[PDB]
Amino acid sequence: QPEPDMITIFIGTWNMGNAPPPKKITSWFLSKGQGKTRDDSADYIPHDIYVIGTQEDPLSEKEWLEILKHSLQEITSVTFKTVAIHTLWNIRIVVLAKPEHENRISHICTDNVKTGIANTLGNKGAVGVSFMFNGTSLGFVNSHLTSGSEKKLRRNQNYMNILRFLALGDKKLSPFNITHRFTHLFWFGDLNYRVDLPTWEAETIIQKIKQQQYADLLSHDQLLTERREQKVFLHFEEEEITFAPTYRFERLTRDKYAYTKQKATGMKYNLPSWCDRVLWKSYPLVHVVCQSYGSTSDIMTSDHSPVFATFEAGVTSQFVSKNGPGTVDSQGQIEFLRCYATLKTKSQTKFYLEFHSSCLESFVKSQEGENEEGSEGELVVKFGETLPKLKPIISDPEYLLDQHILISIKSSDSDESYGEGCIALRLEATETQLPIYTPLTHHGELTGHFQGEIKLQTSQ
Ligand SMILES: C[C@H]1CN(S(C)(=O)=O)CC[C@H]1N
């Protein structure tokens, strides 16, 4: 039985509105309804992994697990294995996988983050799951962010708290937050970003939705506009939205948006909005293709419609050679030429680099770089030709070209990371000087750049 080089992953997000689901929810898992939907000819083909995010979930874990497994069994005739389930208040994540994957999946981690302080601590936050699938690290975040049209800044703050404090993936990757720890990171939930149009335009918005004319609505979607101004979800992707706003519906129909202010809403309008979203971030030059992104039309127990997204994701095998793992392979090396970091920091301390990768036996610390002034104020940290020669555990190009090097630039004074980025070894050539580049971030915000040249030697 050969190891896969591709798997398909189903991501679902549903705010259930504290109501039990209807007896049939198979349309969700089949990516049927509005938007980018899945071909009928694929209906019996199981996804490799199903990741289900719920918000305002009134069910026990046991109750929801039985509905999800019986749903997938009716679709596929496959009895899925429970990889992980984690609940914070009414925010839940379930990960199910095909039984054939049980011994491909390891290093399962779960965590949660509670967002806000006092007033604002008690029901919003995030749950997450990570694991290895063969040689590929996968992370999944289900977040329920702050509600209300006038709280997009709060949502952006909730995002930064979640990516700073959610403890998933390889704890040895100590300078790196969840936005650098995974081959593929999927972040989804009731993110609660709204279509920011005047309240007096509610009926105009509804008109536009009935005409399936989303263009003038999406131009005011707070997640797209905040992303465009680099306020949130920097270096994440989202598929184009071609489905109607998923909030706020009258229950038991999809014929009516319930937008008017009510005691029950705290006297807030809920203009139709794309609250319910799926985004991802994969390492540079790894295959990831969105194959569906849409909403169901036939699940109406909640004031939200379920959202589905499906992805092709590149995966690698658990590589064994005669040499590594458990030693180096003298035939492999990674060299760096003409390298420099450009940092936004106003501070003047010395900096060194750390290189982290599962292709190394352990992380490597460089010598301090030489600080110079950029022509536009910037701090430029020059490494020239001084960076170490990295010794990968396996030299086979079929392994080494699929790997990545995480970089942290750390202060010599404090040993705190000022920026994190990632470099793909999927080079156009080996034994050849090639440009490399990554942006650097810290707490998910842009803090600088790293650029230079790489020279990769493999056993070929
Ligand atoms: C960075 C993405 C998404 N953005 S966006 C919606 O402005 O943030 C446009 C260009 C794309 N490469």
Swiss-Prot record:
It comes from the Eukaryota. Specifically expressed in immune and hematopoietic cells. Expressed in bone marrow and blood cells. Levels vary considerably within this compartment. Present in at least 74% of immature CD34+ cells, whereas within the more mature population of CD33+ cells, it is present in only 10% of cells. Present in the majority of T-cells, while it is present in a minority of B-cells (at protein level). Coiled coil: none annotated. It is found in: Cytoplasm; Cell membrane; Membrane raft; Cytoplasm, Cytoskeleton. Tyrosine phosphorylated by the members of the SRC family after exposure to a diverse array of extracellular stimuli such as cytokines, growth factors, antibodies, chemokines, integrin ligands and hypertonic and oxidative stress. Phosphorylated upon IgG receptor FCGR2B-binding. Belongs to the inositol 1,4,5-trisphosphate 5-phosphatase family. Interacts with tyrosine phosphorylated form of SHC1. Interacts with tyrosine phosphorylated form of DOK1. Interacts with tyrosine phosphorylated form of DOK3. Interacts with tyrosine phosphorylated form of SLAMF1/CD150. Interacts with PTPN11 in response to IL-3. Interacts with receptor EPOR. Interacts with receptors MS4A2/FCER1B and FCER1G. Interacts with receptors FCGR2B and FCGR3. Interacts with receptor FCGR2A, leading to regulate gene expression during the phagocytic process. Interacts with GRB2. Interacts with PLCG1. Interacts with tyrosine kinases SRC and TEC. Interacts with c-Met/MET. Phosphatidylinositol (PtdIns) phosphatase that specifically hydrolyzes the 5-phosphate of phosphatidylinositol-3,4,5-trisphosphate (PtdIns(3,4,5)P3) to produce PtdIns(3,4)P2, thereby negatively regulating the PI3K (phosphoinositide 3-kinase) pathways. Able also to hydrolyzes the 5-phosphate of phosphatidylinositol-4,5-bisphosphate (PtdIns(4,5)P3) and inositol 1,3,4,5-tetrakisphosphate. Acts as a negative regulator of B-cell antigen receptor signaling. The SH2 domain interacts with tyrosine phosphorylated forms of proteins such as SHC1 or PTPN11/SHP-2. It competes with that of GRB2 for binding to phosphorylated SHC1 to inhibit the Ras pathway. It is also required for tyrosine phosphorylation. The NPXY sequence motif found in many tyrosine-phosphorylated proteins is required for the specific binding of the PID domain. This is Phosphatidylinositol 3,4,5-trisphosphate 5-phosphatase 1. It comes from Homo sapiens (Human). The lineage of its organism: Eukaryota, Metazoa, Chordata, Craniata, Vertebrata. The chain holds residues 398 to 857 of 1189 of the full protein.
